[PDB]
Write a protein that binds this ligand. Structure first.
Ligand SMILES: [Cl-]
Lengths: 328, 159
């Protein structure tokens, strides 16, 4: 049959709605598992075992090229060539200046065009969580006593497009939709928006973000005769990133180890893939487990214009009306 | 049959070598060569990184070279034949002649810098003739377009 192939990586994630107010995912909008009688597959010749014959100086390819099954709601999916995009290092004197560059990057995070008339919202570097953990972790360390470093990178594994018409919605969403009243009711419609999102993905990119923040006891660091860059470079090296106390730091697996380099906390913000994880181990794990790192999206009510249930139009105008109020 | 350099010093052999030429009855080589660099470190007493392109992209190959003579090494793979590497002649500081024997052999000339001297080159051609290879079967590798690094997705790590 056709079921022997793994699905296109990330297909379950691209199927989810998005809430722009909460900046988190909602339940599935698209049916991610629907194939509809058709066996479409995608060749991946970006992740094969290279061979090297040292005797003849021959660096050649393994015939271990894979096929992935593309579900009906994905019009296209293209695996990218994996590449290191450059690893950034930043240093901050205080939590706020880090928080600031972070939230500023949440304004770098979103663009917009308007169809010829639906908004098309454009998330770039999108994390799919409220960062409530991260914000509360960091707020433990908003004191003059602490300084911060941050390494960040981003990799895309694929670009995809969703289908534009005869969309098959998730059984969950369909049932919810059936249950919405024809008579406008903000409560019922807001609930639906809370369950399925303010927006759904029409295209995007799979991949990940590899990112760590270090919190550092400045006073302790000085005493050790080291610097914030020393610490970061040592931490970097522990992650496999190519460039006494450091040796003692190791991977910073213990608090003992971390305190050898004045490191109070290692805060992870890694997304996609998978203590800490090594750069190369993270890169591997992005083959099979990406997130939708960048995407285009449209208002939830737009999808009702393009489903296989056909004309669905007073629920659509109620949903739009409701979304107008919800977004304010 | 081929003897390793007497008293081969892995420590002085360490560092970066440029592939200059290979003598070989390899079917592959007789039918686009890439600039190839070797990075050598003794590990115990040798870790060997080869950098070179494939279809415009830089790769790092990691291997290990450890049997108990000096300039004789065992390279292991998948269902490949094991390869014996012999560092037959080198001055540590300008050139090196390595022999690789699978089953029934290639002779490689490396240098620390280019150009190689006339005498290093003649001596290599003489060895190739003595390995029952013709001048036809000497393939010279490029002198530019070296890979200074490979990213983490383009490391083929056999270690
Ligand atoms: Cl060059």
């Amino acid at each position: 049959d056709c079921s022997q192939y793994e699905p296109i990586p990330g297909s379950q994630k691209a199927a989810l709605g998005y809430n722009i107010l909460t900046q988190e995912d909602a339940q599935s909008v698209y049916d991610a598992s629907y194939y509809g009688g058709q066996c479409e597959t995608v060749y991946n010749g970006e992740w094969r075992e290279l061979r090297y014959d040292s005797t003849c100086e021959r660096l050649y390819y393994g015939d271990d090229e894979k096929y992935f099954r593309k579900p009906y709601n994905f019009l296209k999916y293209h695996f990218e060539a994996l590449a290191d995009t450059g690893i950034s290092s930043e240093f901050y004197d205080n939590a706020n200046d880090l928080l600031s560059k972070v939230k500023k990057d949440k304004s770098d995070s979103f663009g917009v065009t308007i169809g010829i008339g639906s908004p098309l919202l454009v998330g770039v570097g999108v994390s799919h969580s409220q960062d409530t953990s991260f914000l509360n972790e960091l707020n433990k360390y908003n004191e003059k006593k602490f300084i911060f470093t941050r390494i960040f990178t981003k990799v895309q594994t694929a670009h995809f497009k969703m289908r534009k018409d005869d969309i098959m919605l998730d059984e969950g969403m369909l049932q919810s939709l059936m249950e919405l009243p024809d008579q406008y009711n903000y409560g019922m419609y807001a609930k639906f928006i809370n369950d399925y999102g303010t927006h759904y993905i029409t295209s995007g990119s799979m991949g990940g973000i590899y990112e760590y923040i270090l919190v550092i006891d400045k006073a302790k660091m000085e005493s050790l005769g080291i610097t914030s860059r020393d610490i970061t470079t040592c931490f970097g090296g522990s992650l496999g990133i190519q460039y006494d106390h450091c040796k003692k730091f190791g991977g910073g697996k213990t608090e003992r180890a971390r305190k050898a380099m004045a490191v109070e906390d290692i805060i992870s913000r890694v997304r996609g893939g998978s203590s800490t994880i090594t750069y190369r181990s993270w890169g591997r794990s992005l083959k099979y487990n990406p997130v939708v790192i960048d995407f285009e999206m449209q208002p939830i009510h737009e999808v009702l214009r393009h489903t296989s249930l056909g004309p669905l139009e007073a629920k659509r105008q109620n949903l739009r009306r409701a979304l107008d109020q919800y977004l304010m | 049959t081929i003897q390793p350099k007497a008293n081969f010093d892995a420590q002085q052999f360490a560092g970066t070598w440029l592939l200059v030429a290979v003598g070989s009855a390899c079917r592959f080589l007789q039918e686009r060569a890439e600039a190839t660099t070797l990075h050598v470190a003794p590990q115990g007493t040798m870790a060997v990184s080869t950098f070179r392109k494939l279809d415009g992209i830089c790769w790092q190959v990691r291997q290990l070279y450890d049997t108990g003579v000096l300039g004789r090494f065992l390279l292991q793979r998948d269902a490949r034949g094991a390869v014996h590497v012999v560092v037959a002649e080198t001055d540590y500081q300008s050139f090196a002649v390595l022999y690789l024997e699978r089953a029934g052999l290639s002779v490689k000339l490396y240098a620390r810098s280019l150009p190689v001297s006339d005498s290093v080159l003649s001596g290599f051609e003489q060895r190739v003739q003595e390995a029952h290879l013709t001048e036809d079967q000497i393939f010279y590798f490029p002198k530019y377009g070296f890979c200074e690094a490979a990213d983490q997705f383009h490391v083929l790590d056999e270690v």
